[PDB]
Chains A and B, each alone.
Chain A
C-alpha cells in the first residue's frame, strides 16, 4: 500500500467531508459538492480523474429525463448490477435530511464525455425515515435481488424536536430494511441481535449476506468491536432475515472500504476513539460461509496524517483510496492523498 500526495485544480473547494465517489467502467466521478451547484457545474456531478498525481474536477451533464438531486453529505451509497448506483438519505446544503432515493446511471458516452441519468425512485411501505451515516447494500439469494439498509442518524421527531436543540441527532432504530427496487416497496424487520443504534459503520456484501463492522452508537457513545452477519432468504414467500454475532470484530467508526481482489477487501482509516484515529489497516477474506479479518502492514503515513485530528475520504474503486486531511488556512483548506493497494 503506497501513499501519494495529490494536487488539485481551481475548484478544489467543492471537496468536503461527506462527499462520494462513484465508479462507472473505470472512470471515476464525484458527487456531493460543498454548497449548491453553481453555473460552472449545474448538476453538482464531476468527472474526477487524477493524472500524474494531479486531480482535475470537470463538470458532467444530465439527461433530459433526469432529476437534479441536491448535493448530499453522508448518504448511503450502493452499486447495483447495466451498472447503476443507489443514493439514499443524506444531508442537503440546507442541512435537511432527504427521504428520497436517486438512481445514477450512464445515459450516454459519446467521445469519452458522459451524460448521466438521475431518476428518483418512489418508495412505499415501511420507508426508512430520512437519515445519513447509514449503509445500503444489495444481496442475492435464490436468483432474486434485494436491498438492505441499516443504521444511521436523523434529527428528533417532530413531536419532541425543539428549536433550542434543533440540530440534535439521534440514532435510528436498528431495524433492517429490505427494499425491492423493482416494485418500490420496503419491509422493516426487528431483530433481537440488533439492540443498539449504529452509524458510520462499514458494510460488506457477498451473495445473501451483509456484514456490519464497527460504527458508533450515540446513546452509549461506544465504538463497539463487534461484527454482525445478516443473512436474507428469498424464497417464493415473504423473505426472512437472520442475524448472527461473530466475535473478532473491528472497532472503527467512519472507516473506508475498498475491494482489492474478488472476495478480499481492505479497511483503512476512520476513528478508534474521538481523539484517536485508526492508523492500522485490516484485510477481510470472505468464505461462502466464513469471514476472516486480518491485521496487515500499516502504510507509511506522513507526520501530517499522524497528528491530524480528522481525516475523511472515499473509495476510488480500483483498490485505491482518496484521502483528505484539514490543511493550512491563510492557502487551500484540505490536503489530499491517494493510497493504492
Chain B
C-alpha cells in the first residue's frame, strides 16, 4: 500500500496512544472521530513530507474405508506425539520397515465389501 498524509497522521497517533496507555484497548469509531478533529498548517507538514518517501517505496515495490497404511498410521499417531508432516514421515518410515501388515489388510478386506455395498 501507499499512505496519504492523513494516514501517516493516524498511524503516529496510534503509536502515541499505545505508548501512553499500554494496558488499553482502543475503540475504532471514537478514535477516527478524535483523530479527524485533531487533523481539522504547520503540524501536518512533517506527515506531508513523509508521504512522498512512502510513494518512493511504492515504486520500489513494483519491481470409503481407509488404506491399510491409513489404519496402521492412525493407531501409531499417539506414540509419535509422545516422541504433521514430520509425524507422517516417521509413520511412513516405520510402516515401510515393518505377515506384519496382514491383519490391517484383513480389516480393510472386510471393509471393502461394505464400501462397495
Check A-B contact in the complex, CB < 8 A. Answer: no
